Design a protein around this ligand. Structure first.
Ligand SMILES: C[C@]12C[C@@]34C=CC(=O)[C@@](C)(CCC(=O)Nc5c(O)ccc(C(=O)O)c5O)[C@@H]3[C@H](C[C@@H]1C4)O2
Ligand SMILES: C[C@]12C[C@@]34C=CC(=O)[C@@](C)(CCC(=O)Nc5c(O)ccc(C(=O)O)c5O)[C@@H]3[C@H](C[C@@H]1C4)O2
Lengths: 411, 411
């Protein structure tokens, strides 16, 4: 009967390049959304995104080695070290075999995909870099990190669009509990603010277009939302078995108590008005954690700020809490952070964790006027202290109707 | 204490468009490798691949719906139905919630990525299809299928390069055993025979170049190998809990008894001469299944026909079997099939299953002269009947040193 605890964090976000700086900015209702400079956004309908500011990996990645990896991989490795360091774990020949990784990404190396295709179109297969495949494939963060640290235990990479982070974190926990691993670095990495990332989700009409105020673009549940905002970043947490952590007196941020998955079985890029999918996922985590919706102090919504998106998640909240629907805090970090896709669920697992450490729940900024019949506490504009909140739940939903929820318990 | 059994198969391969036709061709030492016609391979160093012959989904996918999906997705859905049908399962409002999917792919919609980028480069973000994202992202087979069948249980998509199939099948089993699901469709789909797929792996010098004899190109363990051969296809199996299958008198092909994962922690696109990684993975499945290397009648090698690739897997065999190293049958379907990447481990989980049903183990064709110090039974040129083989093991290894092995038990 093994328990999984969190003994390390690390992250890179549009509002900070450390876990602490990122948390501080989120609690301080800071936006990270900005105008895109790295490419001509003239032809683009959306000209902004939550970018990672002044990213530097020189200390961690040999620029000779950087040539072999998309930014998403770069982002992920940097956030992985952060967490490896913050864990204090020392991998030993006796260890390696029982320390693994579960780290994916929604879209992968778009950047380098684009470079290599441009290259091919211009000068043929000759120009296609020898590093094309290993520099853009989704499981590369797992591979670089496992190597860098001599990790030899289980290594997997779940690519479930926006649900990725939650899935990897959840499946890492499962791996540990099952007995396959003792420690697992898990999370996601994404850097889809590229012509194909921006143009592509804009072609789907899924992006915000509020270019006169990029800062106000992300407004989950607000009556004025017009689609999500793109965000780059990486979120990683070190998960480990209770006794293995204790026996080494690791700093322990929390306990991963429940994990729930569901499927919408409705539409490829959209949820039932019903919110049936999200409920089942929340529903299953609760049954996994073995607690009740009443005990959930804060819900880090999937809330991407898309019209149908936000409404459906709300439906699921009511449905799941019913009574305590109005008494529960629910917010979207996406109001400041943007949508980190493959990394969203990872960075939000961290927020959901830090909210328990600090007994503070970050705001859903930009929430001027809510949707009508909403009875919920969307924790609008300004952060909000909480008292005896012992469990926080994290939601992440993805294209394909693949949903997932994680439950974190204090201590 | 839940057992996972296989109650459905389906697949599309360079040697067949059904499970049975594919098996027949493999046992008959048939190659599927052919010259590529769908694009100018003049500039290309490798001009052949194992392609899916005369693929037709009209019956299953509305060509209006086909516009929204890369071939890999198409391939996967077609093989998924096959398996859904062959299971005989009837999803009911009482069911849906306990039937999920675990289906990934190594590289995803390269084809459509290429089309959309070409499009953008030629006429701007305006031409980027609204279906870019949902038509190329790796978890789309999971999403279409879950919808098509009303599946609402857990849905995940492991993208671990060549290891994908084994991971999804393994994690689907885990999901079931854990109690999260009752039935799970799992496998992988890949259609990377594209300019970027061919040019890209060729840029890495990882592909064969034997264009005068595409049929002889795939030659695992042969002294003359010069890299792997690319293959398109999809492999899907319906996994389910013993009692749930029985209670419905499902046809049961086998029992999934063990699942092992490991990490090379060595090099991004290569294994230790040592084969340390593969051993650990085989090693863990054995401990998971709770049996010994002696009991493994046949090993479906990862054996991709790359110089270092094949040698390292052999090292791991000796290391793992030691004594019974010479008494165990080990082959590579890749000698006829090619490398199906994300689908390799799925289609090979099926072979490994059919080998137990038919007590026949398919050949490693093209194995004219083996590497020297090889003591192993690579099951060269011609198939080979077996007697009381009760367990077969399936190996799949991927870029990033992510390895995995599955163990199947008769009945
Ligand atoms: C075909 C349509 C219908 C349309 C209608 C109303 C909407 O509001 C949006 C903009 C998005 C619906 C939605 O929330 N999807 C959704 C989801 O199920 C899961 C995850 C995410 C995420 O961002 O991880 C997500 O975005 C949809 C998209 C675009 C186009 C317009 O599909
Ligand atoms: C940097 C180098 C070194 C090089 C040297 C010798 C070789 O023989 C190859 C051709 C491949 C080694 C290998 O087997 N990799 C390998 C692997 O670890 C896992 C999976 C697969 C698979 O196909 O799923 C795979 O291919 C490598 C590749 C290309 C280049 C030449 O890396």
């Amino acid at each position: 009967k093994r328990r999984v605890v969190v003994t390390g964090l690390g992250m890179l976000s549009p509002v900070g390049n450390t876990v602490e700086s990122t948390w501080k900015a989120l609690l301080a209702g800071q936006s990270g959304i900005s105008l895109i400079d790295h490419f001509d956004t003239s032809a683009y309908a959306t000209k902004f995104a939550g970018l990672v500011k002044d990213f530097n990996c020189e200390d961690i990645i040999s620029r000779k080695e950087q040539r072999k990896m998309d930014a998403f991989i770069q982002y992920g490795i940097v956030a992985g070290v952060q967490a490896m360091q913050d864990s204090g774990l020392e991998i030993t020949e006796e260890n390696a075999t029982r320390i693994g990784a579960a780290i994916g990404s929604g879209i992968g190396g778009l950047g380098l995909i684009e470079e290599n295709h441009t290259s091919l179109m211009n000068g043929g297969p000759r120009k296609i870099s020898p590093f094309f495949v290993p520099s853009t494939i989704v499981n590369m963060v797992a591979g670089h990190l496992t190597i860098m640290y001599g990790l030899r235990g289980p290594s997997i990479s779940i690519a479930t669009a926006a649900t990725s982070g939650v899935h990897n974190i959840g499946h890492a926990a499962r791996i540990i509990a099952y007995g396959d691993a003792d420690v697992m670095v898990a999370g996601g990495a994404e850097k889809a603010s590229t012509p194909l990332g921006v143009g592509g989700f804009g072609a789907a009409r899924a992006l915000s277009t509020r270019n006169d105020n990029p800062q106000a673009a992300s407004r989950p549940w607000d009556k004025e939302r017009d689609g999500f905002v793109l965000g780059d970043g990486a979120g990683m947490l070190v998960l480990e078995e209770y006794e293995h952590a204790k026996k080494r007196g690791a700093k322990i941020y929390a306990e991963l108590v429940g994990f729930g998955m569901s499927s919408d079985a409705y539409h490829m890029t959209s949820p039932p008005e019903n919110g049936a999918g999200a409920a089942l996922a929340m529903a299953n985590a609760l049954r996994d954690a073995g607690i009740e919706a009443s005990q959930i102090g804060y819900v880090n919504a999937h809330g991407t700020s898309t019209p149908a998106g936000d409404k459906a998640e709300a439906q699921a909240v009511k449905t799941i809490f019913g009574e305590a629907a109005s008494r529960v805090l629910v917010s979207s970090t996406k109001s400041m952070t943007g949508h980190l896709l493959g990394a969203a669920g990872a960075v939000e697992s961290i927020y959901s964790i830090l909210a328990l450490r600090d007994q503070a729940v970050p705001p859903t900024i930009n929430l001027d006027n809510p949707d009508e019949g909403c009875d919920l506490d969307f924790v609008p504009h300004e952060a909000r202290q909480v008292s005896g909140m012992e469990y926080t739940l994290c939601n992440s939903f993805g294209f394909g109707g693949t949903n997932g929820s994680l439950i974190f318990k204090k201590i």
